[PDB]
Each structure stands twice: as structure tokens, then as C-alpha cells.
Design an enzyme around this catalytic site. Structure first.
Site, mmCIF file in Angstrom:
data_model
loop_
_atom_site.group_PDB
_atom_site.id
_atom_site.type_symbol
_atom_site.label_atom_id
_atom_site.label_comp_id
_atom_site.label_asym_id
_atom_site.label_seq_id
_atom_site.Cartn_x
_atom_site.Cartn_y
_atom_site.Cartn_z
ATOM 1 N N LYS A 145 0.865 -1.198 0.000
ATOM 2 C CA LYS A 145 0.000 0.000 0.000
ATOM 3 C C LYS A 145 0.899 1.244 0.000
ATOM 4 O O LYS A 145 1.804 1.356 0.804
ATOM 5 C CB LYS A 145 -0.932 0.019 1.202
ATOM 6 C CG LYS A 145 -2.160 0.906 1.025
ATOM 7 C CD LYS A 145 -3.140 0.449 0.007
ATOM 8 C CE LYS A 145 -4.537 0.179 0.491
ATOM 9 N NZ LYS A 145 -5.321 -0.637 -0.448
ATOM 10 N N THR A 158 -3.394 -5.628 0.583
ATOM 11 C CA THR A 158 -2.840 -4.286 0.802
ATOM 12 C C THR A 158 -3.698 -3.473 1.786
ATOM 13 O O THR A 158 -3.213 -2.657 2.525
ATOM 14 C CB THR A 158 -2.630 -3.498 -0.493
ATOM 15 O OG1 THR A 158 -3.871 -3.138 -1.106
ATOM 16 C CG2 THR A 158 -1.838 -4.314 -1.519
ATOM 17 N N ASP A 159 -4.998 -3.829 1.739
ATOM 18 C CA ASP A 159 -5.867 -3.162 2.721
ATOM 19 C C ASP A 159 -5.536 -3.519 4.156
ATOM 20 O O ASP A 159 -5.627 -2.723 5.063
ATOM 21 C CB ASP A 159 -7.321 -3.517 2.417
ATOM 22 C CG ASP A 159 -8.273 -2.796 3.327
ATOM 23 O OD1 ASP A 159 -8.554 -1.609 3.022
ATOM 24 O OD2 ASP A 159 -8.765 -3.359 4.338
ATOM 25 N N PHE A 214 31.848 29.946 -11.550
ATOM 26 C CA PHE A 214 31.970 28.803 -12.415
ATOM 27 C C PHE A 214 32.832 29.184 -13.620
ATOM 28 O O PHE A 214 32.368 29.757 -14.595
ATOM 29 C CB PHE A 214 30.591 28.249 -12.820
ATOM 30 C CG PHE A 214 30.688 26.877 -13.457
ATOM 31 C CD1 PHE A 214 31.263 25.858 -12.677
ATOM 32 C CD2 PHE A 214 30.252 26.583 -14.713
ATOM 33 C CE1 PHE A 214 31.341 24.602 -13.250
ATOM 34 C CE2 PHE A 214 30.356 25.341 -15.302
ATOM 35 C CZ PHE A 214 30.927 24.347 -14.522
ATOM 36 N N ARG A 244 27.934 34.574 -9.681
ATOM 37 C CA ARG A 244 26.618 34.170 -10.166
ATOM 38 C C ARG A 244 25.758 33.823 -8.939
ATOM 39 O O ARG A 244 26.230 33.640 -7.842
ATOM 40 C CB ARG A 244 26.667 33.001 -11.128
ATOM 41 C CG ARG A 244 27.164 31.721 -10.489
ATOM 42 C CD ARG A 244 27.196 30.525 -11.390
ATOM 43 N NE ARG A 244 27.526 29.295 -10.637
ATOM 44 C CZ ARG A 244 27.492 28.131 -11.284
ATOM 45 N NH1 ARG A 244 27.212 27.918 -12.534
ATOM 46 N NH2 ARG A 244 27.788 27.030 -10.553
ATOM 47 N N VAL A 270 28.976 23.388 -8.101
ATOM 48 C CA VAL A 270 28.042 22.635 -7.234
ATOM 49 C C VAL A 270 28.732 21.360 -6.742
ATOM 50 O O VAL A 270 28.611 21.004 -5.564
ATOM 51 C CB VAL A 270 26.759 22.351 -8.006
ATOM 52 C CG1 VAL A 270 25.786 21.511 -7.184
ATOM 53 C CG2 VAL A 270 26.072 23.651 -8.400
ATOM 54 N N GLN A 271 29.473 20.732 -7.639
ATOM 55 C CA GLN A 271 30.236 19.521 -7.314
ATOM 56 C C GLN A 271 31.067 19.679 -6.072
ATOM 57 O O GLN A 271 31.069 18.953 -5.059
ATOM 58 C CB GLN A 271 31.122 19.171 -8.505
ATOM 59 C CG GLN A 271 30.491 18.716 -9.766
ATOM 60 C CD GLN A 271 29.919 19.731 -10.753
ATOM 61 O OE1 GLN A 271 29.667 20.861 -10.318
ATOM 62 N NE2 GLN A 271 29.721 19.317 -11.974
ATOM 63 N N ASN A 275 20.812 22.689 -10.380
ATOM 64 C CA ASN A 275 21.253 24.082 -10.440
ATOM 65 C C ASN A 275 20.132 24.829 -11.169
ATOM 66 O O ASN A 275 19.957 24.640 -12.341
ATOM 67 C CB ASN A 275 22.554 24.154 -11.216
ATOM 68 C CG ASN A 275 23.230 25.492 -11.132
ATOM 69 O OD1 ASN A 275 22.739 26.438 -10.548
ATOM 70 N ND2 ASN A 275 24.443 25.614 -11.668
ATOM 71 N N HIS A 297 18.776 27.726 -12.631
ATOM 72 C CA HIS A 297 19.451 28.915 -13.171
ATOM 73 C C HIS A 297 18.675 30.219 -13.074
ATOM 74 O O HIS A 297 17.476 30.208 -13.330
ATOM 75 C CB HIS A 297 19.800 28.637 -14.622
ATOM 76 C CG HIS A 297 20.545 27.353 -14.864
ATOM 77 N ND1 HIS A 297 21.807 27.138 -14.343
ATOM 78 C CD2 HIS A 297 20.220 26.258 -15.547
ATOM 79 C CE1 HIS A 297 22.193 25.919 -14.726
ATOM 80 N NE2 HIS A 297 21.266 25.341 -15.456
HETATM 81 CL CL LIG Z 1 24.935 23.403 -13.938
HETATM 82 CL CL LIG Z 2 -4.732 -3.454 -3.888
#
Ligand SMILES: [Cl-]
Ligand SMILES: [Cl-]
Ligand SMILES: [Cl-]
Ligand SMILES: [Cl-]
Ligand code: NA
Ligand code: NA
Ligand code: NA
Ligand code: NA
Lengths: 295, 295, 295, 295
Positions: C10, C57-58, C159, C176, C227-228, C254, C256
Site C-alpha cells: 500500500k 494491501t488493505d 563557475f 553568479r 556545485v560539485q 542548479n 538557473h
Molecule cells: Cl549546472
Molecule cells: Cl490493492
């Protein structure tokens, strides 16, 4: 302070109904999302903690299901009229009922080129909608619409001759993509009550069909001078084809597809007549609206 | 610390392409959303601020458009293979390219029963997708899928004979609604490179067609004992019809439609054989998955 | 054909729990969305219509609520471990339980500078999540995460020095905007079972706090080379501060913000040092990922 | 046919602006989504393909950015007034400008208990909005609002004494959860033009602050007899605290949290005074609205 306006009810009531023909085995399904908001002599629920005037929203929900069980849910214009009429007739102090219905698509499947008796596909999030305002002493006001109808044409859209001043950078064009999400509304003559609505029942499906057909054909065939001009043509034709409509409203975004200049890379030509790859833009978008009525 | 895995690139790159037959006037459009993530000898961009190893994501974006301009974008399995191959061949230090493509529907319009040469409709948010992993020294791994295919059958679904213990309240049923959003994936035999992918190009569209056809027909015709049993039948048939597929994966929500007991209101009968109005449930939902391969 | 993998359960089970201190009057609320998928000796439900192996699932849904009633729902790592353990111990033929929990924020309100005993605000769609895999014979594997943490810095992101070739048009920049939606995951040492998880309970909230603190401080204070590089710094510090974590994963878009050249209009200067108004871009976006472990 | 109403423009224009104090190093960011729709003597663009009357939506977009560069973007009531005034003064044939602004939150981060000079967090999708209608000959009409403010109280909500008839099944309660998404609007006295708007600039931020404070305190402290009664109290107080407001509108969903009877399982008590675990309901929901003005 004082209450100047008040309305309350149940929103987002999902409703399914099935029709089963015992004789043929053919089942037909309907699915909608319903909102019902009531107005009336209910201000004291806001100002004095007086809940005796409140028809509970939970009861409103129950009423939607009960009404769907005892009545046809199609066309939605009729179902909404029946539902809204119920509230203003049942409750002396309720004087208006505002019914919004969103109809979801369940199109019968074709299996091995034969329509299947009980299996359906959601072919698009396009919706068919109604807004039905039942007001005591003022009849029934119905607005019908189609929405979420997304289309694109790859040529035969133009945009030139617009105003140019110190705020303008857009180049004129004689050949662009045009893509939109159609929101089209047709507003019916006031009906005096449920009988009058019932007397016109076949026109609801037929006018929705017309609105959709006209929209698609005009979009496809109009060498568009602008979104404004194309949408007006659509509205004119719908009004000409159903005299019980008073006005047609269109609200159309211009979902831009930008050319991409690739000539910086190996002299690649991808603009103007050589334009093949474009960047669809999520935002911003033009937004063009108009309401057209009879001259 | 040390980098154990790293991949980076550009996501959500929207791409449109048009084909224009100068001779017939017939235009054909394609629209997709592309993601490309690269792996390679790039750890020093993370650990030493060494951006010399970074093929800028903006350049990756440019490359997607350039590749779309110089190559067919259909079938997406081929386009993704070409794109991923480009990165690992162009850049010595890039050793894998992961290409995901979501294909959006633009179905040619029929106007007055004739296909229109340049106007299209989005008939559903159903998507056709590919995941193409191009890994140097390991060929091309392609997973193809259809998703967002929403269907409902109003009868000929059952669910009885499940485990019952002190946590169970669900009643057995011999007749229920079944509705789902189909997510179906077919995983291809590894291809050694672009030539091998090219040698099978017609099978990509044909297998997508088969997967969709089998899905719809089995859903419509199987008097379902459970979602598990129905989905397995679908997977078996797809594997039988395309030997280049190794496995089929289905992921299916059971989007519940609950009966509504209205017998508290005027003795209204709306359950079991008298069930006509149901409450579609937005959540929770069953979620059923399986991967089927060859015995 | 044969089943190669199967799991079912579920999804989208919404759960609220309140704690009420009778003595102080202070109430505390928790809200989550739970998914539980089971694996085991259930293939015959797919291949032979054998529903006897299906824990409905119930029933799974019921079990979630019952478990929440009888146990603490916080920290989610513990609750998920209890829940998954239940399924594999209760059912001989169920050998794995996969529990995903999304925790929604309900932060106590401060009214007139005093915390309110029973009123809460959703301060952001930031989520705290767990993925808890309880596998018979293999203990409990927990991945904890924070997601939807949206941040922006207006300077002190750079960058430059990235690879430049015939596919590159991006200009180098020394100043930036950087904006992202943080998806950060910390993967715990395998636990042998519920006792071991319980023995570390205080570390779950403390490590989530650390991950969030480190993320925010590093984002704010790192004059980012990429970012890395920034994300790696975040991962290093989390690993240094909790030895029971084996790896840290970051997935960062990122988002922008483009400069807008307005010099075509009255010579307006809005680029470089004069950049004040920018166009946030909805798509495309860079997507940067890494998994960091111990050297 | 004839045009009865028409308006067109650019929607979903995302705008960021930064303020940098050179002296302190403190940067401040603003982010919004702007829509501008114009009305005027433009009907011939719809009816006669006369684009000379069209101020291109692309130019409207440019104008938004240019205006943001040359003017403060805060408070949004002022920015919208400046923008709308521009269009009706610049273009003789444009007689109304409708400016909608959605303001997104960028709250300055606190790092090590100190506010950071250039790093921000999106603490919630709560929005601050304005609708500014600049109509030639009719001044400037401003509606200010807050939306997406999601709150919950775990007790001190009641609902009894409502109308009970054959459509009613809801039990009366003296203790329930109340959760809503607040949409609150305050409508200003008409302003004669930009000067008058400018003369009141400090009141815009102060009234937004008041509206939010009153909303939160009343929600937290009112032992609510109904949503109707609580919302009215909020509206009364806002009107009492700012005489330049004419009306206050609230639109509040009642996002239901249902009790779960678990007594079928081992006699577990989870209702009434023993209620601890609840099922949040995604739909349907009550929807309660009112507009309050001065007596
Ligand atoms: Cl980027
Ligand atoms: Cl189900
Ligand atoms: Cl436009
Ligand atoms: Cl309600
Ligand atoms: Na009445
Ligand atoms: Na390579
Ligand atoms: Na077991
Ligand atoms: Na004017």
C-alpha cells in the site's frame, strides 16, 4: 463589521457512476469532481456562532451522492441544475446554490476494432465543465466549458504588424509555431427553472460537440494573423450555431516555441526556413482572452 | 572521504523537432524532455575544485539540440543511443552517458475526417520513454517504457481468497471496479554499440505498439483474479512476441473506487448488485509490481 | 516466463498522530505518508491466481495504523523499523518489507512570543524521509534523507575553468546566483534487527539535525567553485560527524537565474557588476549528484 | 457578433531582483511571478486582424523587467501600481492594466545564530500577492492577499448544533482537529493614482503583517465553534486595525482528519478521548468563504 457576502459548501467531491444495460451487457461510466457552495440567510453562523443555519458540508456531500443515485449525471448541465434546485427548494433559508462540475474522460476502449462493453481509457486530461448557479427568484444560469484541450500547429501562424516602440524587441514573423491549452466557455440564456433546462437537454451535448469541433477546425485551418483573430473566429461560429448561447469566452495561452540559433556550431542553419529544432518555453506565456456576444 | 559515485548533467531539456515534406506539405512533429547525466574521471571536480574535467551542463544542453538537428529523434531508443555514444566517444575521460527521454504525444488531427498536414492534439499525458545507458566497454543498455496510461474497467475484476487474520477487514468480492495508471517497461538485450542498435530500429516502434496493445487487450479481457495475475499475463505475452526483450516490468497502482452505502437514506440500495454510485479514492492505493523474465 | 522480482503493498497512506500531555496540556503532532511493499514467497499470486499468499494491501494499511497506535512514530527510522519487522516476523512467507516514510512539517506556532500548546504551521514543504528495508536474514538497512530544502545565495558562487570546445557557449563567471533544492541522503551501517536500531535512537534526530545544519552552513559560507565541490564539502563533514553513517548522497539541481541584457533599452546596464534584475529559469537545469563514502 | 470584453498580456513572468548594499555587504533578494493583462481600444485585433493596436506581449514582458530595474519591487502594491500606470499612460489606446504579482519567500538564513548577508531559504510556499487594477479615469484598485498559509490545531475546534435532517449523518463533536490553507484578501480604498499609493507605502507591509498575525493568533486561540465564526473574527480585527481597508475576504478549506475506529482489532481504543491516530483526507473538503465589510 458585517457580512457582505458568504458562501460555503463541499469541494472536491469525486463521483463515479455506472450505467449497466442488463440486456446488452454494455456498461457506461461517468466520473466527475463536484463542488457545491450555498448562500442564504446564514450570516449568523459567522457572527453569532449560530450553526442551526448550517446545512453541514458533510450533508451536502451526502446529497451529491444521493442525487447522483436518483438522477442522470449526464449531461452535467442537467445534473447540476437538479442538484442546485434541490438545495434551494429543500431549505427555506438557502437562496442560492453554486454547482461546479468537472467531468473526466472515460472513453470506451476499442479492442481488436470492436468497442469493449466495460473497459475505458482516459484519453487526455481535457475536461468538460459546468458552472450552474441556481438562484431563488432568478432561475438557473449555466456556463458550459471545455478546458485542457492542448493543441499545436507547426506552421500557418503569423505575427507581424504589431506596435513597435522603444520597449519592443520581438521580430515580426510570417511563419511560427502556435500551441495553446484551450479554455472555451459558452454562456446559456437564463433558464427559468428545472423544467426549462430539461426542455433543452439534447442541446447541451450537441453544443459541447460543436464548440469542440469549431475550435479544432478553426485552429487547424486558420492561417492565423494572431491568437486574438483566430479565437474570435471560433467564438463567432459557435454563436451562429446555437441561438440559446448569449456569449462565448476564450482564454488561450500562447505557449512559445523558440527558434535555436546553432550557427555558432559548424555554421549549422536552424533558423527561419531552416528551423527544425526548437526550444519549448515553459514560461512566460502570452495570455489572450475575449468574450464575444451578439451584435 | 572519497567519491564513491558521481554523475552530473542537464535535466528537463525540452526539445521540439519538425519534419517537413516539401513535396506533400505534410509536417510531422516530435516533442520530448531530455536528461543526460555523465560519469567518468571527474572526481577531482568534486574534491579539488578541478573544473577542467567538467563538460559544462550548458554544453550538454547545446549538444542535445545539435544532435537533434543532425539526426532523427525517432525512435527515441535510437536518438538516445546516438546522443550517449557521442559523449563517450567525444570525451576520452567520460565513460558513461545516461540518457532519459520522455516523449510527449502530438497526434495528428483529423478535420472533416481527413488528417491535417500540420495540426496536432495532445491526446493524453501518456508518455513513451527510454532510458539509454551508454557505457564504454559495456555497450548500450536500453529500457523502453510507456507510462501514464490510465484505464478503468467497471466489472470483471475480482478479489477473493486472500489471507485473512486479525489485521484483515477487507471483504472478499466477486465484482469490483479496477482502475490503474500503467507503467510498463521492456528491457532490451544489451547492444554492443550504435551499429547493433541501428540494425534493430524497426523493432523499437513495433515493440512499443505491442506492449501497449497487449496491455489494453489483457486489461479489457482478463476477468481479473488480482492485479498480480493480470499484469503477469501482460508480461508473458510481450516476452513471447519480442525475443530481443529480456525482461518486462509492470508497476500498477490499484486506484480504489469505494461503494457507498446509502441505505441510511430512505432505504436506498447502492451496494453489491445495486451499486451505481461510487467514491473514487485519491489515496491510499495498492501498489503492485513485478519483473518477469524468461524461464 | 517466470517471476524474477515481485513486491506489492500500500502506497500513499496518510497518517497523523497526536501526543497529548495530560499534565501540561501540550500537544504534539506528527504527520507522514507511508508506503509499505512486501516481498516473499508470493510468485504464485502472479502466476497461478493464488491469492492465499497475499497479505491484502488493505490489511497492510490497517497494520500501519495499528502500529502507529501502539508505538512511537518518531523518529521515523524507528517507526519504519518496527513496521517492517512486524511483517517479516508475522508472516512466515514474507521475507522482506520495504518501508518508505515521508514526514511532513508541523512546527509549533509562537503566539505573542510564546509557543502555543496545540497549534502548528507547515513551514515549508521540506520533507524528512526514511527508506527502511527489513530483510529476513539481512537485518535492517536504513537510508535517511531531507528533501525539498530550497535555498538561494545571491553571490559567492563561481563557475570558470570548465572544458571549452566546439560545443561550448557558456561564458566563464566569477560571480553568479546559486539556487538549489537539496536532496541529501545518509545511509546507516546495517543494523542486525530492531534491538540494534533501538540502541541508537537518539542518533537519528541528531544526525538529521547535523545534515541540515551542515548543508545550510556550507551552502551559505562556501565561495563555491562549482556545485560539485560545494556538495562534496557537505558530505565530508556529515561523515566526519557521525561514524554510523557509511555514505552520504547529494542530488542538487542548479536552478538557473539568467542575467537580462537591457542595454537595447535606453542603454540600461543590467549585466555583470550592474546586474540587478534576473530571469529565473524553470527549465532546463543542471543536475549534479555524488555519493561520498569513507576513504 | 461583437467583442464584449477583451484583455491580453503576458503571464508567468518570473522576476528576481537583488539589492546590494556596497557599504555593509548585505544583499537582499526578491522573487515574484508577474502577470499583466491590458484592455483598451483593441477590438480590431480580434475582428479585423489589426495588429497595430497590439502592444506585443513580448514587449509587455520586456517592460516588466525594465520597470523592475528602474523602480523598487517592494512593496508589491507599489510595484504593481507603477507598472500598471506605465501602460495606461504610455499608450493612449490602452485604458486598463491588470497586474497580478505573486511574491515568493526568500528568508535570510541564520548561520551560527547570525543573519547571513547573501543566503536565503524558501520557508514555505506561502505567498504574498497583489492584484492591482489601474483603470484610466478610475484610479488604482488594490487587493492584497496571503495564500498557501497551512496550519493545524489538534484540539479546541468544535462543530455541533448544525441542521440535522434526512440527509445528515455527521455526528456532532466537541473536540476535533482543524486544519486549513489560509487565503486571506484585504481590499484597499480606491486610490486616485500613483501619488496616493505612494503616500501610503508603509501601510502595505504593515497591513500584510497585521493580517498574518491576526490570522495566526485567532486560529490558535479561538475555541472554534465553526470555520465560519473563526474566520469572521479574523476579518473583524483586520478591519479594525487598518481604516484604509474596505473589506476582508477569507476562503478556507476544512481539510478533514478522520478518526479511525480500531476496536475491531484487539479492542483497541482510538476514538473520542482515546483518539491518537487519524487519517488525513485529501478530498473532499469543506470550503468556507466570506467577505466582511464595515457595518
Ligand atoms: Cl549546472
Ligand atoms: Cl490493492
Ligand atoms: Cl503572445
Ligand atoms: Cl466543513
Ligand atoms: Na430556499
Ligand atoms: Na570516453
Ligand atoms: Na517471514
Ligand atoms: Na491610455
Amino acid at each position: 463589521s458585517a457580512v457582505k457576502a458568504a458562501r460555503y459548501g463541499k469541494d472536491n467531491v469525486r463521483v463515479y457512476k455506472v450505467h449497466k444495460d442488463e440486456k446488452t451487457g454494455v456498461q457506461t461510466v461517468y466520473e466527475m469532481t463536484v463542488c457545491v457552495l450555498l448562500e442564504g440567510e446564514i450570516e449568523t453562523s459567522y457572527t453569532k456562532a449560530d450553526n442551526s443555519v448550517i446545512v453541514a458540508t458533510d450533508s451536502i456531500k451526502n446529497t451529491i451522492y444521493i442525487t447522483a443515485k436518483q438522477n442522470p449525471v449526464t449531461p452535467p448541465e442537467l445534473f447540476g441544475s437538479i442538484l442546485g434546485t434541490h438545495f434551494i427548494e429543500k431549505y427555506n433559508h438557502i437562496h442560492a446554490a453554486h454547482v461546479n462540475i468537472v467531468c473526466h474522460r472515460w472513453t470506451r476502449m476499442d479492442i481488436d476494432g470492436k468497442p469493449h462493453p466495460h473497459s475505458f481509457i482516459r484519453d487526455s486530461e481535457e475536461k468538460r465543465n459546468v458552472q450552474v448557479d441556481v438562484v431563488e427568484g432568478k432561475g438557473i444560469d449555466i456556463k458550459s466549458s471545455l478546458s485542457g484541450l492542448t493543441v499545436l500547429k507547426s506552421t500557418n501562424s503569423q505575427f507581424w504588424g504589431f506596435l513597435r516602440d522603444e520597449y519592443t524587441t520581438l521580430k515580426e514573423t510570417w511563419d511560427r509555431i502556435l500551441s495553446t491549452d484551450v479554455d472555451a466557455t459558452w454562456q446559456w440564456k437564463n433558464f427559468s427553472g428545472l423544467q426549462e433546462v430539461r426542455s433543452h437537454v439534447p442541446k447541451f451535448d450537441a453544443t459541447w460537440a460543436t464548440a469542440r469541433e469549431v475550435t479544432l477546425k478553426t485552429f487547424a485551418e486558420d492561417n492565423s494573423a494572431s491568437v486574438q483573430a483566430t479565437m474570435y473566429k471560433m467564438a463567432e461560429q459557435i454563436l451562429a450555431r446555437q441561438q440559446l448561447i448569449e456569449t462565448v469566452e476564450y482564454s488561450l495561452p500562447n505557449k512559445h516555441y523558440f527558434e535555436i540559433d546553432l550557427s555558432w556550431h559548424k555554421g549549422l542553419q536552424n533558423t527561419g526556413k531552416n528551423a527544425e529544432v526548437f526550444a519549448p518555453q515553459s514560461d512566460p506565456n502570452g495570455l489572450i482572452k475575449c468574450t464575444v456576444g451578439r451584435s
